[model samples]
Target: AFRYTRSQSFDIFDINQKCFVLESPTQLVALHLQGPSSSQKVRLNIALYRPRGPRGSAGTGQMPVALGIKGYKLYMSCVMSGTEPTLQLEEADVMRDIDSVELTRFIFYRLDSPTKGTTRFESAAFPGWFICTSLQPRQPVGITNQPDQVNIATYKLSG
Candidate 1:
């Protein structure tokens, strides 16, 4: 069965006013989506923490993010607990079962907020990187830097 903790219950919000939620009642990966009470969620697989350098090189670290839909490329199979209360932004994808190159093409960073009421998913494990829609308007979302100011995500704490 899919497992999660209370820490994963926060809502995701983006600059575009998109309301995101984690909707996986039971699954391996948490789906990040832009809907209230939705069955359609962004699905992905487990991720490993790796830090990348300025040029997108792999940096050595390592973090929530939950919910579900048919959304593929899901990540973060476990939750952070114990001494490390805050999920430090570790950098790198170690899930060989799924490729970070390919997996990041969908969604990531799945937690941390770039700013207030803004939910930013990282394409690369850095402050500026993000998962943005293609030139085709949300079809086949991918990880890109800056993303031409697309800002394709969001979260709301309540209805």
Candidate 2:
């Protein structure tokens, strides 16, 4: 027989995966990548999440969130605003780092001279040989640094 139980907002990512919670000196980015149980694993995407009825904590509560789409639910991360944005990154809980349920709607372009590499997040979370974008079909994201790769790597942090 087998026995197991998943914890609340517990995400599984190693180092080589591209599934990382982007961040800056201020807030955290709510970027998620569906993998393993998915074929479009490298489909890196940005999203918006919100509390229920606007009654919830910042990043400590476990109340499921709604999407910020046209209908309105989450933060609609693509919309640039001085209010709640999804571009900023936050440390909700290490365990839920990948699950990322407490991501505020904010964009943070202030990284501490951060460097990019296909490590834990890129290696474990979303294992992929190519990090395709709206630009190219499939851009390679790995430990090896490539000029073309780095060039396209710099993506506009919209919203």
Candidate 3:
């Protein structure tokens, strides 16, 4: 499941909109937006924080973002004030499973304003990074029984 939160200092006017989707093996997600003029410059930022596990140390260094994750936290202050948007990702701790690895949590912030000299805070569950996997089958098995025999027995007297 995914959750989101948003706030603005003053009323937003002259809004434009868009919607899109991202797909991956583990998750499928959608995104929506409403804002001032599209011609107006906008900024976006994102970050992730995962708890440390037994074998791996806590994450303090930066890491590349994964795909299929949508709408992490956004500060919105800088962009509103006419500055380029910035993004940062930091893992608080390493997380692991027998078969997979992850971070504890994620955070995102943006600095922008439709109204000049204003700041806002927007945050929510950070959709973790998505990793693409190969599609080839792991192993092959020989037929144990004839197709005709299997079909007739399962279907019960079919031609």
Candidate 4:
């Protein structure tokens, strides 16, 4: 059976080891930093919630998670939508319980660890689509389904 983990501050890094930075109030981008000592110090925090009820029989390690930076929650949405999904931000009450309907768009499935100390998140509302970053620096963080399409879907979350 899958289990839930506690929420805490985390630093998310792409495969290139570049850290995420706030490019806009609602946008996140990957940036190469000489060190995390700079003024552009973006923050990451996560909260994991227990599944409201029994999950499907096809059980796996996916856990429901909500990601945040400061006061904004990570929100994933799509219009046409196969090509990509938009990652936006919204003010959130991180301590509140989620309702079924809102959970559909708010929750992300933290995919099983791909490598030591690394994790991946797939949008619960959009199966096969993953939260990803670009190979080039300063590119806005976005979503992709093609494993070879993005620089990295895998990320390391550390305090």
Candidate 5:
């Protein structure tokens, strides 16, 4: 089974198959997806959980968060102003092709600064292919003074 975990007011996100936690703001978000345990592939999506505008801000984090995969390319998109932020896979934005055997692990990082604001990071990995769909703010969840921070959601794609 696959599960999702979130950290609020947190800068970094990390996860395994069982649980996920936020490393301090100085650390990077990492996810470990062990394969050979099951035939199903894994997909991961992350975003800076920002509230609605009029008060909400942009990529408050100094850098853009990244998503890593063991054996696949990564692609993503986002919308930051109106609604809930969403990240998905895009057939056109393929970053790189990775070999499952050579790929021991995958990692993503935010390269900008807090004033630059945040965006959603989404990714997908299959037995033979990987792709990122899109990242965008669809609906506003709530309002708050402090930045809502970033959250990560993982999904499993079964054959």
Candidate 6:
């Protein structure tokens, strides 16, 4: 069983083995595809926080993101506007309200993967849109609806 909490840090790698790299100064995240081996560089470790509930409960997960340049509560959120949903690093307090109108941007529904135990984080705000990395190296992380047509969309999350 795959169980995750905020206590552990996770490194996300795409099919090409390119790890997610956060550009601290610009606050933009992109895959490190230039390097020959992903293990040679420092991995962008992200922490996932499940909603306050049971261990196996079905709920969205919240990810807090940072890259050591600054210390702010920056979270990975999906901007649900324009032609598609885009990834955004927004600074905000912990969304503790369980009201019917909780912010869906900060939440991601962990979807099943096609191989191994890899996972796809579908935007809670944009149901069909998934968090994906561009095929070109160093491009900012974005979302895609046609995951099948892309080089890769599923990710390997390891601590």
Model 3 TM-score relative to the real fold: 0.17
Scored by TM-score, the top model is: 4
Model 1 spans with C-alpha error above 4 angstroms: 1-7, 19-107, 110-115, 124-129, 134-140, 148-159
What's the TM-score of each model vs. the native? 0.34, 0.19, 0.17, 0.77, 0.26, 0.66
Q: Compose the digit string of candidate 2's lDDT tens values, residues 41-109.
A: 211222222223332222222222211211112221222246421121222321212233223222111
lDDT of 3 by residue, 13-114 (tens): 111111212222222221233355333212222222222322233222232211112242222111111342222232222222112232222322222343
- Candidate 5: TM-score? 0.26
What does candidate 4 score on TM? 0.77
Model 3 misplacement above 4 A: 1-17, 25-105, 116-159
User: lDDT per residue, candidate 5, 98-158, as tens digits?
Assistant: 2332121221223322343433222211111112211222122111222223422322221
Compute the lDDT for candidate 1. Answer: 0.34
Tens digits of lDDT, candidate 6, 68-158: 1123456667775576567777765544332222355665666655468787776666667677777777777777777635646788777
Badly placed stretches (over 4 Å) of model 5 are 1-36, 39-59, 68-70, 79-84, 92-159
Ranking, TM-score, top scorer first: 4, 6, 1, 5, 2, 3
The whole-model lDDT of each prediction reads 0.34, 0.24, 0.22, 0.65, 0.26, 0.56
Clashes of 1: 25
Report how far off residue 14 is in candidate 5 (Å): 4.1
Which candidate has the highest lDDT of all?
4
Give lDDT for model 3: 0.22
Q: In angstroms, what RMSD does candidate 1 have relative to the true structure?
A: 11.9
Ranking by lDDT: 4, 6, 1, 5, 2, 3
Number of backbone collisions per candidate, in order?
A: 25, 29, 23, 0, 40, 0
* lDDT agreement of model 2 with the native: 0.24
lDDT of 1 by residue, 39-150 (tens): 4433223233333312334221123222222233233322224632111222333332323443333224455444554444543333345444333322333334454465
